Write a protein that binds this ligand. Structure first.
Ligand SMILES: [Zn+2]
Lengths: 78, 216, 75
């Protein structure tokens, strides 16, 4: 579960902000939030590697708490 | 004849430091004793890497050096930039001709400004405490990782009066398993009684903060 | 030395020669292919391991070589 997939985001959101968003729940050890080079903008889906299982199990619940720019965010195991 | 890692880890007073290869040491007990002593800095990590130190593809794109601010206050960079931008336009004829008829008073900054840059505006840079060894990726992996119960100003996005929106659900769903000892108000922390914050106020009243022996 | 030039500064002439060799050889290298480092050295951007070469003469001589040509056709 150490990693989660996160959908439905707005490009003003940032990886550093995202790390602080999910570390509100529990620390994101490895952050991945693609920067698309071609048009220089984000599609808004994320992958998160944690310390161990603990971060992963919480992950799905952490999704409900999240609400970026008046919108929700998908979090599921991976 | 030699220890495996488990016996070594139990035999240390502190088993977090032992690595795969410490058992290959000629005296492994003393090695793990020294690795767990205070204030000693570890062996640079690239001792085992096959690629040479600092010879890595990311290091190709390093930007030019930037001057400090108190030096850019002198205006040296704009003057010398303009100067060398003229000197690429000149031919060898013209350069060798102004070497016999020179031009005085060209690139002169007054002395008082240069003295003030060094004796008034100098600022100490960011320094690093002992044991903070540089390694190759260091200046990119310097973002670190901010703990629950501590929020950033920007996370403004919530726009909520000051408790957390998620908590109204953490009490519902339960305390997260990943954190065994975490404490948040309303679940197991005072918004019992709430006298914890009063302690800090009373102590903060008690302290004198006047540093001894400073300049007048 | 103003009216008719006297002498020559062979060190600065050698600096000029290095610039003219650089301009000449650089005009035959497309801008993606070569990356110029902070100190004035050059890396080959085709080859996946980015070898770094000291002059443009060496970069051109590298781009002739067979390792570069094999790495070129994959890209
Ligand atoms: Zn090449």
């Amino acid at each position: 579960d150490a990693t989660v997939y996160v959908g439905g985001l707005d490009e003003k959101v940032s990886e550093p902000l995202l790390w602080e968003l999910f570390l509100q729940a529990g620390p994101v050890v490895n952050t991945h939030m693609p920067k698309d080079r071609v048009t220089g903008q984000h599609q808004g889906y994320g992958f998160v590697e944690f310390l161990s299982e603990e971060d992963a199990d919480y992950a799905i619940k952490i999704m409900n708490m999240i609400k970026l720019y008046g919108k929700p965010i998908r979090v599921n195991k991976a | 004849n030699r220890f495996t890692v488990a016996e070594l880890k139990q035999l240390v007073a502190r088993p977090d430091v032992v690595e795969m290869h410490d058992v290959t040491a000629q005296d492994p007990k003393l090695l793990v004793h020294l690795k767990a002593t205070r204030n000693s800095v570890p062996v640079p990590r690239h001792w085992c890497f096959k690629r040479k130190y600092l010879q890595g593809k990311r290091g190709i794109e390093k930007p030019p050096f930037e001057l400090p601010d108190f030096i850019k206050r002198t205006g040296i960079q704009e003057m010398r930039e303009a100067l060398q931008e003229k000197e690429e336009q000149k031919t060898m004829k013209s350069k060798m001709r102004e070497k016999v008829r020179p031009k005085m008073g060209k690139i002169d900054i007054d002395y008082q400004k240069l003295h003030d840059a060094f004796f008034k505006w100098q600022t100490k840079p960011k320094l690093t405490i002992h044991g903070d060894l540089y390694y190759e990726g260091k200046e990119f992996e310097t973002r670190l990782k901010k703990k629950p119960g501590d929020l950033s100003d920007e996370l403004i996005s919530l726009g909520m009066p000051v408790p957390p929106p998620w908590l109204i659900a953490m009490q519902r769903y339960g305390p997260p398993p990943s954190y065994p000892n975490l404490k948040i108000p309303g679940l197991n922390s005072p918004i019992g009684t709430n006298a914890a914050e009063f302690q800090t106020k009373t102590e903060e009243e008690e302290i004198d903060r006047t540093p001894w022996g400073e300049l007048e | 030395m103003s009216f008719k030039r006297e002498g020559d500064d062979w060190s600065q002439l050698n600096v000029l020669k290095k610039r003219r060799v650089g301009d000449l050889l650089a005009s035959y290298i497309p801008e993606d292919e070569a990356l110029m480092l902070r100190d004035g050295r050059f890396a080959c951007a085709i080859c996946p391991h980015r070898p770094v070469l000291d002059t443009l003469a060496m970069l051109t001589a590298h781009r002739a070589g067979k390792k570069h040509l094999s790495s070129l056709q994959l890209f």
